Design a binder for these strands. Structure first.
Ligand SMILES: [K+]
Ligand SMILES: [K+]
Length: 327
DNA sequence: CATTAGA
DNA sequence: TCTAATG
């Protein structure tokens, strides 16, 4: 957590590099299990050799550990850090819709900057265009105070369209968080569950609502179960317009809400931990259901869930307010 | 790890 | 169809 920090930090830098700038999925994966292992190890690595006794730790890596230990740096890291192409790729990637593969291509063609991207809007796809168009606001945080104004509107049209809808704004928002990165709305309807052959409209109706009133301003992607968009709070009585915000809406079979909701509320650890516990408690939890364990090794058969509680009860734990689902 | 665009 | 990108 801190005794082998520089090593893990260096290592992740290393990995991340092979993956993006290079297409070394392998080296990439290498730097990672290592970074992973050296992290668990309870003692200060004092030499590569020492490191090296680890699993995943080879001669390539170990050598890097000495250099890093010896001198507070690493050239390869220093060289990459300087590297314009590579820098370039790192940046392009910040554009929503740009991933490594496109980043490399764009660079290939010579589009290394924001302005470059501009002049060539033609080379970009809708998603990419939008991300470009909203590069600044996409990077901005979402203050809760706004999260509250967003949730407000959201729940309103949802209700207006059909009163039978159930929505929840998940994520760290749900967990307290002073601010968030984007808004995550989980959606369901009684009329749609595991079997009940869809109702694509179910999603459509609301997107259309939100649009109708200008909550929604763009669409990155719209499918029959997962809508990914851009939204904006009504710019008041002027002098202050709001930044464009990423919003994601998802349809869910009512019969899988709460687990979905559980899960997406996190946190990453609260989850893992509650989950680890359902294992002892003779269960299995995951984004959609909660099945009881069977001695033979594994088992099935989804237990019925009508609330976050059902799940809690089941693993015979203390209902944890989302506020304190921190870990 | 599943859903969507796209080409 | 596959492959990329988000989450
Ligand atoms: K080893
Ligand atoms: K990106």
């Amino acid at each position: 957590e801190t005794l082998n920090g520089g090593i893990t930090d260096m290592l992740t830098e290393l990995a991340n590099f092979e993956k993006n700038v290079s297409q070394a999925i392998h080296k990439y994966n290498a730097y990672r299990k290592a970074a992973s292992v050296i992290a668990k190890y309870p003692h200060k690595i004092k030499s590569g050799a020492e490191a090296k006794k680890l699993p995943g730790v080879g001669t390539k890596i170990a050598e890097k550990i000495d250099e890093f230990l010896a001198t507070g740096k690493l050239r390869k890291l220093e060289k990459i850090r300087q590297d314009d192409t590579s820098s370039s790729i790192n940046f392009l990637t910040r554009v929503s819709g740009i991933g490594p593969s496109a980043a490399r291509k764009f660079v290939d063609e010579g589009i290394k900057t924001l302005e470059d991207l501009r002049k060539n809007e033609d080379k970009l796809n809708h998603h990419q265009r939008i991300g470009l168009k909203y590069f600044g606001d996409f990077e901005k945080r979402i203050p809760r105070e706004e999260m509250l104004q967003m949730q407000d509107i959201v729940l309103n049209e949802v209700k207006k369209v059909d009163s039978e809808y159930i929505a929840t704004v998940c994520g760290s928002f749900r967990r307290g968080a002073e601010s968030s990165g984007d808004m995550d709305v989980l959606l369901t309807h009684p009329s749609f569950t595991s079997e009940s052959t869809k109702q694509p409209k179910l999603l459509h109706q609301v997107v259309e609502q939100l649009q109708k009133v200008h909550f929604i301003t763009d669409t990155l992607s719209k499918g029959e179960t997962k809508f990914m968009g851009v939204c904006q709070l009504p710019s008041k009585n002027d002098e202050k317009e709001y930044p464009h915000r990423r919003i994601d809406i998802r349809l869910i079979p009512k019969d899988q809400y709460y687990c979905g909701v559980l899960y997406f509320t996190g946190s990453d650890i609260f989850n893992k931990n509650m989950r680890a516990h359902a294992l002892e408690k003779g269960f299995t939890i995951n984004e959609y259901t909660i099945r009881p364990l069977g001695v033979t090794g594994v088992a099935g058969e989804p237990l019925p869930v009508d609330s976050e509680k059902d799940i809690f009860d089941y693993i015979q734990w203390k209902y944890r307010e989302p506020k304190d689902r921190s870990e």
